[PDB]
Design a protein around this ligand. Structure first.
Ligand SMILES: Cc1ccc(C)c(C(=O)Nc2ccc3cc(-c4ccccc4)nn3c2)n1
Ligand SMILES: [Mg+2]
Ligand SMILES: [Zn+2]
Length: 313
């Protein structure tokens, strides 16, 4: 109970910032996550022994893929920590508990393939879950790990608190299905512009937590340029492997996934910033003003991609 976690001085300072990079020392990522739970939630939210055993089983169940790996899980959880710390009073005890766990678990047992590739391959997971195929798997893996002995980090919650927190974790993980994001933002945009948005409406909170999850999941586009640029290599390594696999099935992949079309990458980033990233962080800055730095960093990176096209790098 009197045991705290402390980071070195640079991490202690930089970790509060949206654009923090968790760095290349894997063995420090668990301490970073625990430190974020303790300041975000309390030193009393979880039994330290259970939380650590939970963190290590979650790590074990992320695969060695180029992008959708353990580092992504912790990066996405750090983005949520920054949003929660900059919006202290807006969220309940349970939501802060549930969302950091949801973020750490959101891509459990990912194989580096889109829902689309699962459907065209006829993967068994696509028979079991017709929509948000991987996202229903990820939630399923989360429940499994929570049911291992010594792993119930929610043991001290009531029956109905426990069910509320698993329902928050489920909606949060489903919402990382980017196919659901477009409608979700459109509805938040309309609700905010006609002043109907109400945070005591549970169906409204759900949508807002959905957008936060999208924003944390895409937070690669909100880092400083050198981090954003190097992360894009990992993202495309998965996309091009998926493209190769599409060709193996006898299907011409979309150009995003075709390694023969590396040349067109910079223009593809423009489209994604214009269609997805900027609208995401814009709508988020409108609903949650203190998240504005994410919008600013995304715009900076769009500007860096335009410079790449213009031969200026
Ligand atoms: C989910 C997520 C999170 C972060 C990023 C950064 C991306 C991401 O990079 N998304 C996208 C979207 C569309 C798109 C088209 C292209 C293209 C490439 C080469 C030739 C032609 C077209 N790349 N590309 C990339 N996606
Ligand atoms: Mg995912
Ligand atoms: Zn993700």
């Amino acid at each position: 109970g009197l045991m705290q976690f402390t980071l070195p001085v640079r991490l202690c300072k930089e970790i509060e910032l949206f654009h923090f990079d968790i760095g290349p020392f894997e063995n420090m990522w668990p301490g970073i996550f625990v430190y974020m739970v303790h300041r975000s939630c309390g030193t009393s939210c979880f039994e330290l022994e259970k939380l650590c055993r939970f963190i290590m089983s979650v790590k074990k169940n992320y695969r060695r893929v180029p992008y959708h790996n353990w580092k992504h899980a912790v990066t996405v959880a750090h983005c949520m920590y920054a949003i929660l710390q900059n919006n202290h009073t807006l969220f309940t005890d349970l939501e802060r508990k549930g969302l950091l766990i949801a973020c750490l678990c959101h891509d459990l047992d990912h194989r580096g393939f889109s829902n689309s590739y699962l459907q065209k391959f006829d993967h068994p997971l696509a028979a079991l879950y017709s929509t948000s195929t991987m996202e229903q798997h990820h939630f399923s893996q989360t429940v499994s790990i929570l049911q291992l002995e010594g792993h119930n980090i929610f043991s001290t919650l009531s029956s109905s608190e426990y069910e509320q927190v698993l329902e928050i974790i489920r909606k949060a993980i489903i919402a990382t299905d980017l196919a659901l994001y477009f409608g979700n933002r459109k509805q938040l945009e309309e609700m905010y512009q006609t002043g109907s948005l109400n945070l005591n409406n549970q169906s409204h909170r759900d949508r807002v937590i959905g957008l936060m999850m999208t924003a944390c999941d895409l937070c690669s586009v909100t880092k400083l340029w050198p981090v954003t640029k190097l992360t894009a290599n990992d993202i495309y390594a998965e996309f091009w492997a998926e493209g190769d696999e599409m060709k193996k099935l006898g299907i011409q992949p979309i150009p995003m996934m075709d390694r023969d079309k590396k040349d067109e990458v910079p223009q593809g980033q423009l489209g994604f910033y214009n269609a997805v990233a900027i609208p995401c962080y814009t709508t988020l800055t409108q609903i949650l003003p203190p998240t504005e730095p994410l919008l600013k960093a995304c715009r900076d990176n769009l500007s860096q991609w335009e410079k790449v096209i213009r031969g200026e790098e």
